[PDB]
Ligand binder design. Structure first.
Ligand code: CL
Length: 240
């Protein structure tokens, strides 16, 4: 097994922070980070605490929304110290922190979300996590940990939602141009909520909204990724 590590690409004028998904890793952002690199952007992809190991309990017991927020904030600061302009985007979980960054952190030009409606709703993250864990056990040749997982999973998902509702209540604070990309066949989160995110951004300079018709949740990696990369780069170039 290869532990995915955080990674960084050097740029000149503009840098981008990319924040990964729950149960994800910097691997979530390989295609995106490279697309940005080809267009001359600096890129930074941190690893959230408890992620990127062969042991799914690490996510539940070594990470939490508060730690991941601190890590997101540090990542932004790392990039704003170096580049004239900084954009911040996040996939699903990462999107929550991306939006909080726009709301509360200084020195950010623009940013937004990939399949991250922010507003909590019906989701399939419980089956998602369990399927992920099962696959991780399969690679590790380790016995099933579902019972141990279920002691923590509902609590951690509640904690994520709790963090998210504060971000949602603060959406009025966003002044920056905001990008919203959403999977149209999203099996993990309620895509409909992305419209409510759009409508809540009442003070954003602009809202650039994209719907990826046939795409599953992970639009940074699946069939939608070329389109998403184009749309994100177009967004950034518009706000240069
Ligand atoms: Cl997620």
């Amino acid at each position: 097994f290869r532990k995915p590590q955080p990674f960084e690409y050097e740029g000149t004028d503009t840098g981008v922070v990319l924040l990964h998904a729950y149960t994800g890793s910097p691997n979530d952002m390989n295609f995106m980070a490279r697309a940005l690199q080809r267009s001359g952007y600096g890129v930074y992809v941190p690893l959230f605490s408890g992620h990127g190991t062969v042991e799914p309990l690490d996510i539940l017991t070594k990470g939490n929304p508060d730690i991941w927020w601190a890590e997101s904030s540090a990542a932004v600061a790392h990039m704003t110290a170096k580049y004239a302009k900084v954009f911040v985007f996040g996939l699903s979980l990462g999107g929550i922190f991306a939006m909080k960054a726009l709301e509360t952190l200084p020195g950010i030009t623009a940013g937004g979300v990939f399949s991250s409606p922010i507003l909590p709703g019906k989701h399939h993250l419980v089956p998602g996590f369990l399927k992920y864990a099962e696959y991780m056990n399969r690679l590790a040749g380790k016995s099933d940990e579902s019972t141990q997982i279920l002691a923590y999973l509902p609590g951690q998902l509640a904690a994520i939602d709790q963090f998210a509702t504060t971000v949602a209540a603060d959406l009025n604070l966003v002044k920056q141009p905001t990008f919203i990309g959403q999977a149209g066949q999203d099996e993990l989160v309620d895509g409909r909520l992305a419209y409510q995110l759009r409508d809540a951004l009442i003070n954003a300079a602009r809202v650039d909204f994209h719907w990826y018709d046939d795409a599953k949740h992970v639009i940074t990696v699946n069939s939608a990724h070329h389109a998403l990369e184009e749309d994100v780069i177009a967004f950034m170039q518009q706000e240069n």
